[PDB]
Chain length 296, copies 3
């Protein structure tokens, strides 16, 4: 008499894998998901951060549901979305995950946070979608930049045992990628965008303006702290001590929503920025730079 | 194919509102619920504590599901139950919450802890009723008194994002008011009693005896620490070092249940108190005073 | 219209009891379950640890669902599995719990963590089975040894209010014993084995090898720290600085799985141990000693 969650959890187990990064004096472990039949595996950047920054000493292996251990190769990584793509070579009959549409997720939707069964402290957790489009800060594992993602929030527990693993709907479809770096997942639609750039280019380009913001709230937005010289920000008129209240068509409540709002902008296209300057409401215009010009 | 919790959460979203209290150098946010069509909104006292104690500097606004922001007015507040009533004026076609009966709640009952969708870090959480009539201490936000409430305990998460919002049964009925001050809610039947006094009198009167208690357990109750001079306690015979084991018809296990037991008593009516004094079991008689005589 | 969990929780309430251990200057409380009609009650060892180590000062009582309080007698205890068996004498018409089979539990299975309704801060929590055969360390309450158990992991909350109480499937069958010493339970099949030895012998015998291990992970197992003189370990050839990678037919990932693996072995029977010694893979043979020879 198989249970509702038991059936769903069982159908996706083959699509989830353990990811192990070992050296002479360390080991790191995480979960990941088969998204392409050629052998493409998606996980968090923090899971493999160390192996990516110290590749001469770290070896990465993928452990499958059937105990099979296969060497893995890093295709690309995005510390800004906490995403990374691995590739295993010539592995026959993989079970590829059924990818969903995160736009069609609603608050109250029941979900599972699936970790790879063959993990040391692997965990499968149950809950509901508690919030959508929730900006969340994440700490950088090693030399990596701290970031903020527009996440799906869930009351299912996300921990070391399911981080990098899939967030799954009641149709066994991946609606997100668990990140434990009170549960938070990166939406599947964003992962589809970042994974495609990483498979094809080995990298991804994000917009930049040159602004360090602090959050402000009184009678609410992102307070400009530092503006870099020769930034699109300085060349747009943005001064220090301004309160950013809207980036593009997106209103901003704080420093967290500012970071997410800037990454929604188009590189090289003029974009409006609304700021409160010493009481007056000022609208300026900025053209975003690529974070990495040579890959752009 | 709408989910069980998705449907319930959706039906009550219009009855839940964001409550924002801002000044020149601060902002505070919370959730609340429409209980009356004239515009009556119930939330926690800690959400609006600061605006109530510093009204010359704080402005309170209510943000509806349809983005509508309306100024709000404080009707009354009860730090002792962590409840407060607001009123918005002349707002047409409000969706008033369907109030339930907390007496008919059982352990195991599935519930949602709904926060106002238009809140910064608003949260909708799912769980079950884990305990009924659970005395729980609460910290006082500002100059407010710390209290203890006879709560409904739930394994659904209650946090800043759903505090003041409704605890909802599977019939979309409010069975409680979430308080994040491991989830705890104030029962709907108690909120109905306190809300009626606050709408009508702008205040509420609670019983007092004049006893400070510490909890004791050996071969169990509330140990009398301090008795105020001219208290109903001193005039009833209660001495310091006594162990209160029963207040009225309610047995008391500790200092927490004592506080809740005293508020169940009738003001001005003689009431029995059973104490263990140096080994002997003594029954005394007290007549409770009003905490606020001018409003009584 | 009784809810799914409400019905299950209600059917087992009579089989769960409060356990209170009091002295002149202390009291301790826990939950337990009726497993035998003669009056046999199973709980955690940490709940009654103090009363077992200081029996001249501590009195243990069992409080039933119908308020009935009965003196209890300690039959036996296992700090190594955190299990203890109590016995109440001549109590008519007990509701004995329906014991399940923990071998037939699966990840995703919905469960309840039931605490005794008549407990001070008793709790009933809901969740799913998140992991099976998960070694978990436990702290020793008083003079008791810290241990590690092969647990069932669950996302249902296990705390002071449900510790010692049953973990229950959707058929109202006990599949485990909650231990709060992120939820962990001891499997019913293991409790059945340990309870039978405790009822019959007043004690239980576990295997010993004489090895203190630390966990190691690089390019993974239990690193031998201390070997006791005249131990089966020293007499088998085990040297210090070895990495135990397999005990019997069980692979070992760390110090935690080592402890659980040793207790699965047969006392007095030769058993294989595989170790990595200075790079070389070495297989040795050990014969396990009883932890308590006089009871063996």
């Amino acid at each position: 008499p198989a249970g509702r969650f038991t059936k769903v959890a069982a159908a996706v187990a083959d699509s989830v894998v353990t990811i192990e990064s070992v050296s002479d004096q360390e080991g790191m472990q995480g979960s990941g998901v088969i998204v392409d039949g050629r052998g493409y595996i998606v996980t968090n950047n923090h899971v493999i951060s160390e192996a990516a920054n110290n590749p001469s000493q770290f070896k990465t292996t993928v452990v499958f549901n059937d105990g099979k251990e296969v060497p893995a190769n890093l295709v690309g990584r995005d510390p800004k979305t906490d995403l990374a793509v691995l590739k295993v070579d010539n592995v026959d009959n993989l079970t590829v995950a059924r990818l969903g549409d995160s736009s069609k997720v609603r608050v109250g939707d029941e979900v599972l946070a699936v970790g790879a069964p063959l993990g040391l402290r692997s965990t499968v957790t149950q809950g509901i979608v508690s919030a959508l489009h929730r900006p969340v800060p994440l700490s950088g594992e090693g030399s990596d930049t701290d970031t903020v993602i527009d996440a799906i929030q869930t009351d299912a527990s996300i921990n070391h045992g399911n981080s990098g693993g899939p967030l799954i709907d009641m149709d066994a479809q991946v609606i997100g990628i668990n990140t434990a770096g009170l549960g938070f997942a990166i939406p599947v639609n964003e992962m589809k965008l970042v994974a495609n750039s990483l498979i094809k280019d080995g990298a991804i380009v994000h917009p930049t303006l040159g602004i360090s913001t602090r959050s402000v709230s009184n009678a609410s937005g992102a307070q400009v702290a530092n503006v870099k010289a020769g930034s699109p920000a300085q060349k747009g008129g943005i001064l220090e001590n301004d309160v950013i209240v809207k980036v593009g068509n997106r209103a901003v409540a704080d420093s967290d929503e500012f970071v997410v709002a800037v990454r929604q902008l188009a590189i090289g296209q003029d974009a409006p920025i609304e700021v409160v300057r010493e009481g007056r409401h000022v609208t300026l215009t900025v053209k975003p730079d690529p974070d990495s010009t040579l890959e752009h």
